[PDB]
Amino acid sequence: LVHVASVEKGRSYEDFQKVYNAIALKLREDDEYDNYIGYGPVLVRLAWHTSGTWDKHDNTGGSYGGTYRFKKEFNDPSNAGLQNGFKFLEPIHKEFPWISSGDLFSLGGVTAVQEMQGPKIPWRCGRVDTPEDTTPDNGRLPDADKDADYVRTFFQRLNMNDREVVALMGAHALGKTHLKRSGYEGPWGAANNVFTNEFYLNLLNEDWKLEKNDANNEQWDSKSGYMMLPTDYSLIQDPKYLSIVKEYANDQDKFFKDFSKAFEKLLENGITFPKDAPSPFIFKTLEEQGL
Ligand code: HEM
Numbered sequence: 001l002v003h004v005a006s007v008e009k010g011r012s013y014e015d016f017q018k019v020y021n022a023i024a025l026k027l028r029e030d031d032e033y034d035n036y037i038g039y040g041p042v043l044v045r046l047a048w049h050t051s052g053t054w055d056k057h058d059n060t061g062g063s064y065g066g067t068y069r070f071k072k073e074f075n076d077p078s079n080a081g082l083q084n085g086f087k088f089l090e091p092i093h094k095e096f097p098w099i100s101s102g103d104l105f106s107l108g109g110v111t112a113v114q115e116m117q118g119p120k121i122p123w124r125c126g127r128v129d130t131p132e133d134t135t136p137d138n139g140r141l142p143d144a145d146k147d148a149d150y151v152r153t154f155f156q157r158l159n160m161n162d163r164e165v166v167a168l169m170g171a172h173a174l175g176k177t178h179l180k181r182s183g184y185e186g187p188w189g190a191a192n193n194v195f196t197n198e199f200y201l202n203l204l205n206e207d208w209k210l211e212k213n214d215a216n217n218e219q220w221d222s223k224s225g226y227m228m229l230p231t232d233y234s235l236i237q238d239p240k241y242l243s244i245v246k247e248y249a250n251d252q253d254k255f256f257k258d259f260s261k262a263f264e265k266l267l268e269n270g271i272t273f274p275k276d277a278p279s280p281f282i283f284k285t286l287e288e289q290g291l
Pocket residue numbers: 041042044045048081142143144145151168169171172174175176177178179181182183184229231
């Protein structure tokens with residue numbers, strides 16, 4: 001099945017910058033969430049999980065149809081906690097009812113990365129809502145208790161190579177694991193609502209111990225109070241991933257550029273853009289607008 005991007009009727013860059021701005025202003029205002037972490041991290045994770053159901057073999061799942069709005073997908077155990085990002089976006093969708101669901105979930109992620117001082121992420125419109133029977137089954141999102149071979153094979157289904165995988169994993173600088181939500185507990189670092197290359201620095205420089213948490217699962221812990229999942233730690237156990245981790249720990253601009261490309265790609269798998277579609281949009285931050 002081919003999914004052709006279709007621009008919301010009559011809309012252009014200024015319309016989508018208004019949606020960006022409303023997301024960004026609510027991110028600033030609603031600052032108490034998650035012990036003052038704020039909604040940035042969970043909006044990034046929402047964009048990823050709504051895109052990461054894609055299967056390159058038959059073009060099922062992906063960001064195009066906005067299927068998270070249907071109960072089979074919002075109740076996926078893998079999506080526990082993402083309802084907080086959906087509730088955040090509800091008043092945004094009410095103000096701007098013309099935007100598609102897939103366009104709003106993906107734009108939330110772009111807006112969060114940029115407002116937290118991350119790279120610019122070019123973004124294209126045109127996702128179209130598809131019906132309930134197009135919702136992908138549970139079980140397409142990854143397990144955290146696995147090794148590097150698992151991670152590498154997993155991401156081939158999303159058409160991601162080693163560099164793209166290691167870059168995308170740098171989003172684990174953000175937010176935290178929550179025991180009741182998945183079975184892991186703790187932040188990955190100190191700057192968890194500012195977008196930086198801290199994930200790579202901590203992997204290489206902290207003194208990690210393999211411990212069991214209070215849900216009886218193994219995770220890596222440091223005396224600073226940080227953690228890594230087994231799949232995070234696999235990036236320094238595998239020698240191919242390790243080289244790339246060292247590259248990003250030593251070059252913040254390279255990490256920003258490679259993250260931007262991989263994250264746009266993730267958000268666009270499965271979508272066919274007509275030859276005469278608009279060029280990708282680059283939104284201005286609130287700070288850049290003086291707002
Ligand atoms: C092998 C792949 C991955 C695995 C197994 C994995 C697993 C996890 C787990 C278990 C959590 C904690 C959920 C919770 O308890 O709240 C989490 C959080 C998060 N993940 Fe991933 N993840 C992976 C890839 C990614 C990618 C590719 C991105 C985005 C580019 C991403 C972004 C996030 C963010 C931003 C959080 C924090 C959410 C919050 O604070 O509410 N993850 N991940």
